[PDB]
Amino acid sequence: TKCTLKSFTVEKGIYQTSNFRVQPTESIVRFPNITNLCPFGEVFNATRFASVYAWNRKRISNCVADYSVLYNSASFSTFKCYGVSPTKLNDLCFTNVYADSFVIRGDEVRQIAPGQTGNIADYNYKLPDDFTGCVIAWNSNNLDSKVGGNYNYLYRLFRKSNLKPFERDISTEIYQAGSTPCNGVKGFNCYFPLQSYGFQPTYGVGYQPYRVVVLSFELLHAPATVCGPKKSTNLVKNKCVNFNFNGLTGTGVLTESNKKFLPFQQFGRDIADTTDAVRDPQTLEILDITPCSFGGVSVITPGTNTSNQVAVLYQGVNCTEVNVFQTRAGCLIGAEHVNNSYECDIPIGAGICASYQTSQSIIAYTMSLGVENSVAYSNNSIAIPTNFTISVTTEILPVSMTKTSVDCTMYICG
Amino acid sequence: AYTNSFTRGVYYPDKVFRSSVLHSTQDLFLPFFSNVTWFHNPVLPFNDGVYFASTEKSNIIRGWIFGTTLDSKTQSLLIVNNATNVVIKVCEFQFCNDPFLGVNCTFEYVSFKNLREFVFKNIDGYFKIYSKHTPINLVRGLPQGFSALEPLVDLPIGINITRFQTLLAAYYVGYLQPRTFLLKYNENGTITDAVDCALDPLSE
Amino acid sequence: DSTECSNLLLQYGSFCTQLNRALTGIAVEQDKNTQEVFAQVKQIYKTPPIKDFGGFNFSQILPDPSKPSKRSFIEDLLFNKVTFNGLTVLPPLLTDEMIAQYTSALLAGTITSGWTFGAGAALQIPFAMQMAYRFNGIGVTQNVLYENQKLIANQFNSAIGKIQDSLSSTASALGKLQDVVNQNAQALNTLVKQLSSNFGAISSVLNDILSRLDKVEAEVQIDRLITGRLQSLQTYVTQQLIRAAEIRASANLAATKMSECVLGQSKRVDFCGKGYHLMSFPQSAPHGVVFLHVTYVPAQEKNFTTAPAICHDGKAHFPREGVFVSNGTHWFVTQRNFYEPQIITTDNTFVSGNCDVVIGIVNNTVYDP
Amino acid sequence: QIDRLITGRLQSLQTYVTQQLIRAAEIRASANLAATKMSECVLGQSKRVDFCGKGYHLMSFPQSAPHGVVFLHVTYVPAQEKNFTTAPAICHDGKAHFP
Amino acid sequence: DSTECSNLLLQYGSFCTQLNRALTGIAVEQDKNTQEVFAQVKQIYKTPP
Ligand SMILES: *[C@@H]1O[C@H](CO)[C@@H](O)[C@H](O)[C@H]1NC(C)=O
Ligand SMILES: *[C@@H]1O[C@H](CO)[C@@H](O)[C@H](O)[C@H]1NC(C)=O
Ligand SMILES: *[C@@H]1O[C@H](CO)[C@@H](O)[C@H](O)[C@H]1NC(C)=O
Ligand SMILES: *[C@@H]1O[C@H](CO)[C@@H](O)[C@H](O)[C@H]1NC(C)=O
Ligand SMILES: *[C@@H]1O[C@H](CO)[C@@H](O)[C@H](O)[C@H]1NC(C)=O
Ligand SMILES: *[C@@H]1O[C@H](CO)[C@@H](O)[C@H](O)[C@H]1NC(C)=O
Ligand SMILES: *[C@@H]1O[C@H](CO)[C@@H](O)[C@H](O)[C@H]1NC(C)=O
Ligand SMILES: *[C@@H]1O[C@H](CO)[C@@H](O)[C@H](O)[C@H]1NC(C)=O
Ligand SMILES: *[C@@H]1O[C@H](CO)[C@@H](O)[C@H](O)[C@H]1NC(C)=O
Numbered sequence A: 001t002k003c004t005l006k007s008f009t010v011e012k013g014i015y016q017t018s019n020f021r022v023q024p025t026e027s028i029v030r031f032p033n034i035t036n037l038c039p040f041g042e043v044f045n046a047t048r049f050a051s052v053y054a055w056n057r058k059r060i061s062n063c064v065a066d067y068s069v070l071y072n073s074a075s076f077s078t079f080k081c082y083g084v085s086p087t088k089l090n091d092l093c094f095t096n097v098y099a100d101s102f103v104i105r106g107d108e109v110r111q112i113a114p115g116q117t118g119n120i121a122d123y124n125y126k127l128p129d130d131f132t133g134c135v136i137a138w139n140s141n142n143l144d145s146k147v148g149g150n151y152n153y154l155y156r157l158f159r160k161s162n163l164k165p166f167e168r169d170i171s172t173e174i175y176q177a178g179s180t181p182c183n184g185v186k187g188f189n190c191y192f193p194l195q196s197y198g199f200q201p202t203y204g205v206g207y208q209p210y211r212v213v214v215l216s217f218e219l220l221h222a223p224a225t226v227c228g229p230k231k232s233t234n235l236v237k238n239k240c241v242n243f244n245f246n247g248l249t250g251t252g253v254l255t256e257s258n259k260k261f262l263p264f265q266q267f268g269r270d271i272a273d274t275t276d277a278v279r280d281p282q283t284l285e286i287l288d289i290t291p292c293s294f295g296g297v298s299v300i301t302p303g304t305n306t307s308n309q310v311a312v313l314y315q316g317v318n319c320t321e322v323n324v325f326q327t328r329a330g331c332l333i334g335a336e337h338v339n340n341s342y343e344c345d346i347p348i349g350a351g352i353c354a355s356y357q358t359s360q361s362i363i364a365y366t367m368s369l370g371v372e373n374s375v376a377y378s379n380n381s382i383a384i385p386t387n388f389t390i391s392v393t394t395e396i397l398p399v400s401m402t403k404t405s406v407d408c409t410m411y412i413c414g
Numbered sequence B: 001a002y003t004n005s006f007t008r009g010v011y012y013p014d015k016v017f018r019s020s021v022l023h024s025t026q027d028l029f030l031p032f033f034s035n036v037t038w039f040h041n042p043v044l045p046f047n048d049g050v051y052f053a054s055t056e057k058s059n060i061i062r063g064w065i066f067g068t069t070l071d072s073k074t075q076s077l078l079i080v081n082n083a084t085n086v087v088i089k090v091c092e093f094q095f096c097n098d099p100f101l102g103v104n105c106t107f108e109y110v111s112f113k114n115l116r117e118f119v120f121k122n123i124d125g126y127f128k129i130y131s132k133h134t135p136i137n138l139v140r141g142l143p144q145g146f147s148a149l150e151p152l153v154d155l156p157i158g159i160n161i162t163r164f165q166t167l168l169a170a171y172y173v174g175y176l177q178p179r180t181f182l183l184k185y186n187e188n189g190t191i192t193d194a195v196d197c198a199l200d201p202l203s204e
Numbered sequence C: 001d002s003t004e005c006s007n008l009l010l011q012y013g014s015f016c017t018q019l020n021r022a023l024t025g026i027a028v029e030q031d032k033n034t035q036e037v038f039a040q041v042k043q044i045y046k047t048p049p050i051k052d053f054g055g056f057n058f059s060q061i062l063p064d065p066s067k068p069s070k071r072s073f074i075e076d077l078l079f080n081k082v083t084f085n086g087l088t089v090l091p092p093l094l095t096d097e098m099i100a101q102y103t104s105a106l107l108a109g110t111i112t113s114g115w116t117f118g119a120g121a122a123l124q125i126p127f128a129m130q131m132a133y134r135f136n137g138i139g140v141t142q143n144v145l146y147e148n149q150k151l152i153a154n155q156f157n158s159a160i161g162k163i164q165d166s167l168s169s170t171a172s173a174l175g176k177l178q179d180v181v182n183q184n185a186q187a188l189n190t191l192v193k194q195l196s197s198n199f200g201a202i203s204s205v206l207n208d209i210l211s212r213l214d215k216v217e218a219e220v221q222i223d224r225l226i227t228g229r230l231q232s233l234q235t236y237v238t239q240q241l242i243r244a245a246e247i248r249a250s251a252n253l254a255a256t257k258m259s260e261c262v263l264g265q266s267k268r269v270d271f272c273g274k275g276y277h278l279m280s281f282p283q284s285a286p287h288g289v290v291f292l293h294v295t296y297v298p299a300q301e302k303n304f305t306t307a308p309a310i311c312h313d314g315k316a317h318f319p320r321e322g323v324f325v326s327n328g329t330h331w332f333v334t335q336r337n338f339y340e341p342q343i344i345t346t347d348n349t350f351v352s353g354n355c356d357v358v359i360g361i362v363n364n365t366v367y368d369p
Numbered sequence D: 001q002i003d004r005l006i007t008g009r010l011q012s013l014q015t016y017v018t019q020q021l022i023r024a025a026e027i028r029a030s031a032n033l034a035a036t037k038m039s040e041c042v043l044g045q046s047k048r049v050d051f052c053g054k055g056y057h058l059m060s061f062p063q064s065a066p067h068g069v070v071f072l073h074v075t076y077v078p079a080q081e082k083n084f085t086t087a088p089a090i091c092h093d094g095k096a097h098f099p
Numbered sequence E: 001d002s003t004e005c006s007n008l009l010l011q012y013g014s015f016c017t018q019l020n021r022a023l024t025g026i027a028v029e030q031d032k033n034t035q036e037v038f039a040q041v042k043q044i045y046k047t048p049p
């Protein structure tokens, strides 16, 4: 109160010094039952796999991409994400993702990077120098390798010009190495463009087959149909909480309710736009929202020139949220409840007043309007005054203010 | 040919419950007492969006196509009822100049005594659909009365549309406009009445 | 309670404190207005168990002991017919039950003791004699009441009956009180609806700005919502300061009609309702007061010939109180506000000068008793 | 930067002048009441109940005060009552006498 | 009467509507002030010839 008034002496009264506010006891986040997981497992667990000159692709869309199912798995001999850290991918969204996927020897996996050069990068699958997406790879000698050599996997050795970013070329066209004519068939200066690693179980790790998947992301004018999955908390009723239902943030005492939303409706609003209810997106009950309790805090005080005791009123607050006494004006703390009644010293509200009285303490009581008097009326009785008092009554009226004037140009600038 | 729309074609404007209240909103509604084009079929413009309705229980009105060309050069919505539920695709179909039913790609989905009413509108990459099915006692005109269409689907397809057509006995078509409407919600939170604020000085 | 916004709002300085100090000033005035209107009486007077008020029937305006609160019958009609974004409504200091104890005290004083409970301690007087001295205060001689007391009581009881029917017939009778409720509701709904507005910011949702943008870009958008919401509050507080000055001007008028019409008998023409004022009764209503102003209205005139003076033995006689009239041929003196003709006499009249001077004087006989 | 100080200081000065225009209307209403109390209570004898203090008004005296006026209202208060029996009229020779 | 400005003015919300509503309250009150002063009298009395 002394700080509120910028004074060391406080005169008798009731002073609002602060605002009370129940703080949110915990945070709630709620989204619908996590469903339509993106089908990455159809690629990473495939029996067959692509030759790198003719890589496989699938358009991943309209699904939740749980990248943590990928990056939590220590199975991957490489897991490089470009522009973004892998853990952040469970938060982000994209228009589509593509599983650009193939087999090569373990050494040539070094060519799978933004702006790389070499047989794979330039003649089979090119990544742009500013890529964004994840290169993922693992050793597949347990799947893609054969006694005497698996010659079915192929890479392009020869091309006349490099493939552009994400460009593809299946052609078996003969590489003409000079002025020598080739007529579409193999020969001297006329070499076949596709070649094999011939994978054998005896190979060293640089020659052993590796499976590769590059998760190519995109974001277009079309909406972000692929997103990292949102987690949900437990749900709380009859406590003040911070909350988020779908995209609707707030803070309040959530409760059950009898309101009957239509089957497509998600939020309730009161007359002046304020949210009054929400459907929980997992179990489709209607929660009432009411704000967390708040109100002015007022210090009831006799003057500091008479006592240092005070009593405190939490205006419009129930004592369960905060002698301790529940008035209709608010929870009142440090004032004695009294069954007598008196004239008002300090007003509290809703018929309550408080005063400093008898050992002396602050008391709070229902105010007295005056002494009751049954007037002695009867159809033949009159009272007549036998004497008088002249009485002099001081009445005080204000008549004029202090005459301020301001030069606004000197106040504003100077 | 044409008929008067009366008070048909209101739909729930947002996914929000409100009750015993009058709410004022601006959106692509069918204007009150506007003309609807009447048919027993031609390709039509789409503008900002379309109200469509029919007297139908034979299921001869099978579906719709939406796009610009409606043919091969670019993506095109196909929406069809398979006599069990709705089926949807958006691929660049090389389908006919006038297709009917006998009596790369980016999205796909699967779901008289009566009037069936629909609204289709496309905003910021979402194709909205709303509908209602209701009993009637009149053969020719739209039924003079009021009931509000409810959202079916909210399809995130990311496509541009300027024309549409119907895959084939009355049906009726009307373009939506950015009117202001005042909507009356009852205790159940249903829109039970509406006022078109532009219609006349009493409605203002 | 967004901390990013709250830290910016500190830079606007004392604006927020002077809004609360202004709204607190208005809140104290509402209790001061309510005190100055109703708390004019030093004691809680109460009516006797018997109701021998000379045939007048106050039952429709005295307290009902059976009601859940001690309001009168007409105060129940009046209480029936009027009908959290950091906002709090505060309760009044006097509850509606305490306001009904003051209207009871004012009314029970007025009925049992007349004007006297305003001037001092209440002095009992029989109600027919109180009405006789309220008649005598409007220039109608007191016998005009006592000779017509049953008629006057029946007209009063009937006129009180019409107030129930009038207040039951339409809520539009309480229009001034219901308007004062509707304006405060309209002002708060407008203050709350302004939270939905953008004020040129990217979004009107404060946590949404803090999600779309990084710190310095978000801060530049939040300062638009702070400016627009601060201007929205300054507009509301300015409008409530003007509306409270308008209600204080009305509360000072109600405190004056309490002091002058209820605690006394006004001679201020049309101040305490039309007609000559007899008395009035206060009844409470939500956010206001209702006065039932009882007034004498003169109602069945006759034309008479008149003269300013009469000659006798060359002396010009003038009426002491009242006016001369002719009953076609005979001459009489009557009181001014009610036809009660008497023979002209040396004690009905006084003499000045002689018949030469007065314009319009007539010749007659003054009877010397 | 200076346009932010000009905007804030100008809105700060508009807030002061608005509240002073409203406060001047409160003090004008009080000065018109005080001028009326001087015309009716001091220069006259008011019959307006409780206008010039409690009791029946005899006279009042103005005293000045800083920014105001103080009236010493002098009033008759009736002070020592007795109960009496009473009647509206007195019958004599079959005719009613009234006071 | 410029549309490019009017669309920005809508972003300030209810300020425009409450300014029109305040001045309409000023305007309607002037006829009340004039009725309260002069229309004290129930009939149009005439002086004799
Ligand atoms: C979510 O899963 C729970 C499992 O108990 C089930 O009760 C609930 O109906 C499901 N909700 C949705 C929207 O699928
Ligand atoms: C109030 O202050 C004055 C001056 O300091 C002092 O004389 C007086 O005793 C104080 N009041 C009480 C009740 O002590
Ligand atoms: C206060 O809060 C408790 C618990 O919420 C509740 O039982 C009680 O009814 C509330 N009201 C009062 C006046 O105690
Ligand atoms: C006040 O009154 C209540 C109800 O009669 C009673 O329970 C309580 O003991 C009383 N307290 C005091 C201090 O008189
Ligand atoms: C009247 O009151 C005065 C004091 O005010 C007292 O002296 C006097 O005796 C009383 N009685 C009469 C009849 O004067
Ligand atoms: C509206 O339709 C009616 C037929 O139902 C037609 O007579 C009228 O000309 C049409 N008006 C317009 C403006 O289309
Ligand atoms: C909804 O409509 C039904 C119709 O029978 C009615 O019983 C009910 O009271 C209404 N309100 C709610 C909230 O259900
Ligand atoms: C007073 O009026 C009420 C309602 O008209 C009536 O019930 C009551 O009996 C009346 N009292 C007397 C004493 O006539
Ligand atoms: C009084 O007499 C005149 C005679 O011309 C007449 O016009 C007028 O209506 C009469 N008024 C009453 C109240 O009888």
Ligand SMILES: *[C@@H]1O[C@H](CO)[C@@H](O)[C@H](O)[C@H]1NC(C)=O
Pocket: C327, C328, C329, C330
């Ligand atoms: C009044 O005048 C008429 C004739 O004008 C006369 O008959 C009557 O007796 C007189 N007295 C009364 C009391 O009417």
Ligand SMILES: *[C@@H]1O[C@H](CO)[C@@H](O)[C@H](O)[C@H]1NC(C)=O
Pocket: C359, C360
């Ligand atoms: C009264 O008025 C009439 C008409 O103006 C006139 O004839 C008559 O002489 C007047 N008498 C007096 C005494 O003024």
Ligand SMILES: *[C@@H]1O[C@H](CO)[C@@H](O)[C@H](O)[C@H]1NC(C)=O
Pocket: C311, C361, C362, C363
């Ligand atoms: C009144 O009487 C005197 C005689 O006593 C006479 O001269 C005079 O003319 C009379 N006046 C009238 C108005 O009749």
Ligand SMILES: *[C@@H]1O[C@H](CO)[C@@H](O)[C@H](O)[C@H]1NC(C)=O
Pocket: A376, A383, D081, D082, D083
């Ligand atoms: C008058 O009579 C009443 C009857 O109850 C009594 O209380 C009172 O003391 C008497 N005297 C005076 C001066 O009022």
